[PDB]
């Protein structure tokens with residue numbers, strides 16, 4: 110249980126993590142299925158207890174970079190995955206990415222989007238440069254390295270309101286801006 | 292593999308009618324005495 | 340080779356611009372197989 | 388303003404855990420990349436649509452702690468400091484009235500593996516490769532941009548929409564408004580108490596309405612519904628035979644050789660591919676529906692929140708005075724204030 | 728005002744002389760239509776379950792009975808590859824058709840007139856805009872009055888001189904700390920309350 | 922398909938052959954409707 114394996118039951122060849130289910134199968138039941146019509150529980154046939162099936166832990170991979178013109182350092186997002194599992198994604202089993210050089214860790218960070226590696230969490234907030242998600246962004250900066258940060262929305266400012274006070278412009282600028290529509 | 296029910300059907304024919312034993316066929320064997328279903332799950336085993 | 344090398348290979352460019360980019364999803368492969376079936380001991384009546 | 392971001396493991400959807408199927412799926416070329424890219428073009432423009440509606444102010448205006456607004460009572464629509472998100476009382480009404488199936492809110496497998504692998508649509512979507520993604524802005528950051536737009540408005544009127552904020556006493560400001568719809572400014576100050584009583588009463592009617600009924604936010608709920616309905620249908624599209632022996636891939640592959648399986652499997656590769664080629668089209672068109680809604684909302688922000696509109700019925704039914712933006716799940720809600 | 732204007736237009740030249748960064752909106756449309764043509768072309772490399780990606784390699788090898796079982800695979804593959812491209816091109820044409828209707832609206836309201844619409848002709852109070860062309864698009868040089876240096880003033884919503892209330896016909900009342908004045912809402916020029 | 926007529930196919934062959942031919946009619950049409958409906962969905966967006 111809890112490990113990733115090529116299970117078969119009765120010729121139901123799948124792949125997953127087996128787990129002790131809390132399902133009260135009625136005595137005639139041997140299978141349970143997903144809303145999707147795929148098996149997701151099954152009674153063990155030699156030793157009558159009920160197993161949950163989960164397809165083995167996995168997710169999308171995405172890469173963060175300042176551009177080749179400036180650096181060959183990149184940071185990597187494991188979208189939808191707590192950092193502990195990433196060690197569990199050791200090359201002692203054959204991951205779909207064969208590159209596993211980032212499972213060294215040391216700068217490992219958890220986010221709402223997943224677990225982020227090769228980038229450093231800096232408490233200081235900046236303008237969003239590369240959007241990671243959920244208010245986190247990343248950038249390459251100072252001895253350059255990739256930093257990750259919660260973004261700053263803009264300067265905080267308390268306006269000078271009072272029940273009897275007014276600001277008036279004594280001077281102006283005549284700005285010009287571009288605006289480009291296809 | 293595993294199987295939920297199994298049956299064997301045992302009979303004799305001429306060799307020139309073995310082609311009629313496969314599913315969805317025609318000919319007097321396949322029309323008047325032994326028909327398989329259109330989805331037939333199983334295997335056909337014949338010898339002189 | 341490395342995450343940059345997958346991204347170059349993916350964009351089919353030898354030079355990658357500033358951004359965030361998608362790459363082949365990861366999934367732990369099974370360590371080994373598990374087989375499980377009911378234990379029966381007699382063999383089926385093939386001689387009959 | 389937005390809809391749920393999504394991405395599909397195109398290979399795992401069509402060919403989940405098989406090398407044999409991947410080596411068939413390869414024979415079509417770029418189809419899965421074109422699908423993946425298209426979902427990405429949608430997902431990336433959701434961060435655009437969110438940005439363009441809400442991130443219109445580059446300076447985060449905070450309210451004074453005192454409230455000397457001359458009898459107008461924004462307490463239900465300003466930030467309430469007591470709450471863990473700095474959202475207003477009416478926003479905490481709006482945030483309850485919409486049901487959502489996830490939003491990216493950390494799936495970490497301590498829940499979604501084992502028991503909650505079964506009784507959850509979204510974990511099955513996540514097991515067929517159908518990854519929802521979190522938006523770039525958290526609802527606190529939307530609440531802050533909204534707070535800044537609202538705090539800027541109640542303290543400075545239209546002046547922050549042109550440049551630096553210029554403070555003005557509210558009652559007086561409303562005088563400039565009234566003067567913009569041509570009811571001369573004295574008519575406000577001669578009735579300020581009656582006006583404040585009606586403005587507060589009209590906010591009281593917004594509350595009493597949107598609290599009581601279980602239906603009101605239909606125009607947002609139908610988006611959140613159509614996203615999930617299309618993914619739940621795309622999940623059902625995996626259950627079909629398409630004329631093949633079984634709608635499970637490994638129950639073909641265990642039962643057949645290298646050639647009879649190629650005849651079967653390509654049926655699923657066809658049917659399934661046509662199921663993503665449908666779904667991604669349906670999203671690219673809906674995305675054009677929500678884009679138009681978002682660009683329109685970014686104009687309703689620019690013209691009803693950053694200013695007073697002389698455009699009849701654009702800022703709700705009546706002569707416009709001013710409007711207040713409110714964050715919502717995937718949406719903006721304007722509260723228009725009008726002279727009638 | 729003219730020296731600020733000639734300097735602002737100077738900054739537009741000096742800025743767009745340095746970089747491509749601003750033109751990403753045109754450059755992306757070009758990139759995307761080029762990409763889709765590369766994608767439509769590159770599909771011809773694909774087997775689509777046929778023995779070959781190449782049509783002549785089917786015909787130069789099979790009889791009519793078999794060739795049709797190869798050729799209809801090619802037809803099916805390529806057909807769907809056109810349909811996808813044509814779908815993408817129609818939906819992307821809708822993104823551009825909106826971009827054109829908006830550009831025609833910005834032309835009518837910010838070029839042929841002065842719009843009171845906030846932020847439609849850009850951040851600040853619109854004066855006028857000049858169109859410039861671009862490859863497959865339009866560019867607008869929007870000129871805006873922006874209030875830039877402010878001072879604090881004390882104010883009253885009305886004044887009393889003989890028990891009657893007084894209000895500005897136009898403008899607002901202010902005090903410099905010592906004397907009251909009336910002034911125009913968007914620029915400090917004080918005048919005697921007459 | 923050997924005919925665009927659904928019952929000519931049903932007359933000339935058998936069910937297995939229908940899986941070869943009637944199936945073509947199933948596919949090609951279902952592509953036809955998806956084509957019309959897509960054109961109508963895009964078109965509908967212009968009319969909105």
Ligand SMILES: *[C@@H]1O[C@H](CO)[C@@H](O[C@@H]2O[C@H](CO)[C@@H](O[C@H]3O[C@H](CO)[C@@H](O)[C@H](O)[C@@H]3O)[C@H](O)[C@H]2NC(C)=O)[C@H](O)[C@H]1NC(C)=O
Pocket residue numbers: 903904905906
């Ligand atoms: C508020 O603004 C007022 C207008 O600028 C200003 O008052 C003006 O002050 C000047 C001197 O600084 C006076 O100038 C006259 O001074 C004497 C008066 O006898 C004459 O001999 C001179 O020839 C000259 O005419 C203005 O007459 C006076 N005007 C008014 C209406 O007061 C205030 O000082 C300003 N206050 C602050 C706090 O800045």
Ligand SMILES: *[C@@H]1O[C@H](CO[C@@H]2O[C@@H](C)[C@@H](O)[C@@H](O)[C@@H]2O)[C@@H](O[C@@H]2O[C@H](CO)[C@@H](O)[C@H](O)[C@H]2NC(C)=O)[C@H](O)[C@H]1NC(C)=O
Pocket residue numbers: 269276877878879
């Ligand atoms: C406009 O005035 C406010 C506050 O009123 C002034 O306070 C004194 C400094 C003095 O000028 C009085 O005669 C005025 O009535 C200014 O607000 C202060 O801003 C600074 C930062 O610049 C901040 O550290 C202080 O805590 C603020 N003080 C208060 C009381 O709010 C404001 O800066 C003035 N702005 C302009 C444009 O003149």
Ligand SMILES: *[C@@H]1O[C@H](CO)[C@@H](O[C@@H]2O[C@H](CO)[C@@H](O)[C@H](O)[C@H]2NC(C)=O)[C@H](O)[C@H]1NC(C)=O
Pocket residue numbers: 191192193194495497
């Ligand atoms: C991954 O991290 C999450 C925290 O984000 C862990 O979840 C916590 O688990 C403990 C024990 O079950 C609970 O008491 C906490 O309330 C949980 N908090 C949250 C936010 O989940 C989770 O256990 C971690 N998983 C692994 C495998 O380490």
Ligand SMILES: *[C@@H]1O[C@H](CO)[C@@H](O[C@@H]2O[C@H](CO)[C@@H](O)[C@H](O)[C@H]2NC(C)=O)[C@H](O)[C@H]1NC(C)=O
Pocket residue numbers: 279280281282730731876
């Ligand atoms: C209003 O602001 C302008 C600048 O935007 C001021 O003009 C500048 O004045 C300084 C001297 O004070 C000169 O050195 C600059 O050359 C001027 N700029 C230009 C473009 O000519 C102007 O003096 C300010 N006026 C007020 C009333 O404050």
Ligand SMILES: *[C@@H]1O[C@H](CO)[C@@H](O[C@@H]2O[C@H](CO)[C@@H](O)[C@H](O)[C@H]2NC(C)=O)[C@H](O)[C@H]1NC(C)=O
Pocket residue numbers: 454460462463
């Ligand atoms: C603004 O209106 C709110 C209610 O709409 C007022 O807050 C209420 O104050 C009373 C009296 O103490 C309490 O009984 C209520 O429970 C409060 N309601 C809430 C939601 O806080 C507020 O006092 C009004 N402001 C002014 C200046 O009168």
Ligand SMILES: *[C@@H]1O[C@H](CO)[C@@H](O)[C@H](O)[C@H]1NC(C)=O
Pocket residue numbers: 154155156377378
């Ligand atoms: C399988 O064999 C074991 C002993 O080898 C026994 O405990 C068990 O009962 C057998 N299975 C069944 C279904 O009886």
Ligand SMILES: *[C@@H]1O[C@H](CO)[C@@H](O)[C@H](O)[C@H]1NC(C)=O
Pocket residue numbers: 178179
């Ligand atoms: C990138 O290279 C270009 C030349 O191709 C150069 O003009 C630019 O300054 C470079 N930028 C950086 C950050 O290296």
Ligand SMILES: *[C@@H]1O[C@H](CO)[C@@H](O)[C@H](O)[C@H]1NC(C)=O
Pocket residue numbers: 230232
């Ligand atoms: C960031 O700030 C927190 C306090 O909010 C502190 O505990 C933490 O050590 C800081 N991180 C670093 C790297 O200094």
Ligand SMILES: *[C@@H]1O[C@H](CO)[C@@H](O)[C@H](O)[C@H]1NC(C)=O
Pocket residue numbers: 272273455
């Ligand atoms: C401003 O409000 C305070 C109460 O907060 C009041 O005491 C004061 O008299 C008011 N002043 C004006 C000019 O309205």
